[PDB]
Every structure is written in structure tokens, then in C-alpha cells.
């Protein structure tokens, strides 16, 4: 409504915006750690069988 009240609404909104973006970015990089390991495991297994 008035300048104190619109700013109180602003503070809440960017808090949610920022938080959500942090979680979303976290899940993409958390899957990134994992996908690096599974893929590395497969590639390494195939070659070790050729070497063996």
C-alpha cells in the first residue's frame, strides 16, 4: 500500500525468488557430480576389458 508496506512485500518476494534459484541450480550441479561418476565408471570398465 504505502512505501513501508510495498517494500516489506518486495523483501519477501526476492527472498523466495533467490532461494528457489539457489535450489534449482543446486540440483543441476548435484546431478552433475553424479553423472560424472557413472559415465566415468562405464567408459573405464569397457576399456579395462580391452586392456585385460
Amino acid at each position: 500500500l504505502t512505501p513501508n508496506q510495498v517494500n516489506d512485500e518486495l523483501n519477501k518476494m526476492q527472498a523466495f525468488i533467490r532461494k528457489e534459484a539457489e535450489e534449482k541450480a543446486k540440483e543441476i550441479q548435484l546431478k552433475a557430480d553424479q553423472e560424472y561418476e557413472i559415465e566415468k565408471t562405464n567408459i573405464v570398465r569397457n576399456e579395462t576389458n580391452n586392456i585385460d
Partner: protein
């Protein structure tokens, strides 16, 4: 402070996009590393094999 706040929110959604993209670039790179560090991982196991031939 109404139109000073709108400006802050349009920016925040842009930032939200960018934060997500930074992670999206990182994910693609981590996949390229998987192949390279797996290629380095095989020329260390080929010498581990050669070791036990020379031992023999």
C-alpha cells in the same frame, strides 16, 4: 519506491535465470571431464599391467 522495486524484481528473475545457467554450463563441462579423466585412467591401468609382466 514502487517503480524502484519493480526494477529490482525484473533483475531478480534475470538473475534467477543466470544462476541456473551457471549450473547448466557446469553440468555440461563435468560430462566432458568424465571422458578425459577416464582416458587418463586407462593409461594408468595399462602400466599397472605392464608392471606385472616385468615382475613375472
Amino acid at each position: 519506491s514502487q517503480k524502484n522495486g519493480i526494477a529490482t524484481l525484473l533483475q531478480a528473475e534475470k538473475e534467477a535465470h543466470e544462476i541456473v545457467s551457471k549450473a547448466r554450463k557446469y553440468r555440461q563441462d563435468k560430462l566432458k571431464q568424465a571422458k578425459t579423466d577416464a582416458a587418463k585412467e586407462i593409461d594408468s591401468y595399462k602400466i599397472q599391467k605392464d608392471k606385472e609382466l616385468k615382475e613375472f
